[PDB]
Design a protein around this ligand. Structure first.
Ligand SMILES: Nc1ncnc2c1ncn2[C@H]1C[C@H](O)[C@@H](COP(=O)(O)OP(=O)(O)OP(=O)(O)O)O1
Length: 378
């Protein structure tokens, strides 16, 4: 008996878990009341292993012991060009062991990427178990459409470590389309999935033909996401603070972390308000920080980045031999797609066509995973 199978979006920056319960798909809030969980692990000098929100929000003078973005490394060999570039930019140690990338931290220990992902999966499993009031042994887990055989198998291996039999690996854009019921329709349609995540931007052109999906083409930017928009705002406020006060706060890791946290919060607030206050007590050398950020300034600071999302869309259409007017559905994925300017740019690109967002874009992939998982449950 496989019991109740869960659906897990194992994301680069954030992860999400859904399940069929009492005849309905439920996206599950974790113990902090959040329906997404950062794919973060923090290894404390005391020794306790922090996972999720507790890991991402821990103030630390030693950020090199915080692990994230394991999905960038999972299922890859050492000399994969992607690995060789990512080890330049990741703020924790990635070292070669047995010709593969491993993560080295002070807890000292070295972890395979699948071991880190296993800790994230365990947290998502625990989240589902608390909601269901029962043990979970089996899951459907999503991956990017471009993931190869090794990356798919490594994701299943992360499952095994977490005590999960990953019964199906399914594609992320496909899962999002399944959330909207697009798999339960007669006929043939072209679906553009526009997935702007926390660290990555994926555009996929799917065809759907009487319940069967084909990923026709994929494009995007492997290093563009919500966090890049935060960093633009960070740079803005570090520069303003140095102008106003004379101090360069980047000297203090905890001060940068406090600012990042408030910037993330302000950014979200600006999806539903035209301005937001960033207030930090004892920000740097005992001095308080208080500034306002308007939506106009947020947009100005990121306009090039927002506009850059359109060229990958054009490339996927070209590669699929389709024109804009052949797109039947636009499915938005990722919380960054709630940014009013992004929604505007997407709609305008498709000459006024309303892109679908009636299912929370941060939850849609998990939702589709859960739909598929429902059919497998015992
Ligand atoms: N990554 C993001 N970038 C920009 N804005 C975001 C992002 N994620 C969420 N938002 C915005 C959309 C909303 O205005 C606000 C709250 O989003 P969310 O946590 O998904 O809750 P919600 O919209 O379902 O409401 P609630 O949980 O309170 O019922 O933040």
């Amino acid at each position: 008996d496989v019991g109740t199978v869960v659906g897990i979006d194992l994301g680069t920056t954030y992860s999400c878990v859904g399940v069929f319960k009492n005849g309905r798909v439920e996206i599950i809030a974790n113990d902090q009341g959040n329906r997404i969980t950062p794919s973060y692990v923090a290894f404390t000098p005391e020794g306790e292993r922090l996972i999720g929100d507790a890991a991402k929000n821990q103030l630390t003078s030693n950020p090199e012991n915080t692990v994230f973005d394991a999905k960038r490394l999972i299922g890859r060999t050492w000399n994969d060009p992607s690995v060789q570039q990512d080890i330049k930019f990741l703020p924790f140690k990635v070292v070669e062991k047995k010709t593969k990338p491993y993560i080295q931290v002070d807890i000292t220990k070295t972890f395979a990427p699948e071991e880190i992902s296993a800790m994230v999966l365990t947290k998502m499993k625990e989240t589902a178990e608390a909601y269901l009031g029962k043990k979970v042994t089996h899951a459907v887990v999503t991956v990017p459409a471009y993931f190869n055989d090794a990356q798919r198998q490594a994701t299943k291996d992360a499952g095994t470590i977490a005590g999960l039999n990953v019964m199906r690996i399914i594609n992320e854009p496909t899962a999002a389309a399944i959330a909207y019921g697009l798999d339960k329709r007669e006929g043939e349609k072209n679906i553009l999935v526009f997935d702007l995540g926390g660290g990555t931007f994926d555009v996929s052109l799917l065809t759907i033909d009487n319940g069967v999906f084909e990923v026709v083409a994929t494009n995007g930017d492997t290093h563009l996401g919500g966090e890049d928009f935060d960093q633009r705002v960070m740079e803005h406020f570090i520069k303003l603070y140095k102008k106003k006060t004379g101090k360069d706060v980047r000297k203090d890791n905890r001060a940068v972390q406090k600012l990042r946290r408030e910037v993330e919060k302000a950014k979200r607030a600006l999806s539903s308000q035209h301005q937001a206050r960033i207030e930090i007590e004892s920000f740097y050398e005992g001095e308080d920080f208080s500034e306002t950020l308007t939506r106009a300034k947020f947009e100005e600071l990121n306009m090039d980045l927002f506009r850059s999302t359109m060229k990958p869309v054009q490339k996927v259409l070209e590669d699929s031999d389709l024109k804009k007017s052949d797109i039947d559905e636009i499915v938005l994925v990722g919380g960054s797609t709630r940014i009013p300017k992004i929604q505007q740019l997407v709609k305008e690109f498709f000459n006024g066509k309303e892109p679908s967002r009636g299912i929370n874009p941060d939850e849609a992939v998990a939702y589709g995973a859960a739909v598929q998982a429902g059919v497998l449950s015992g």
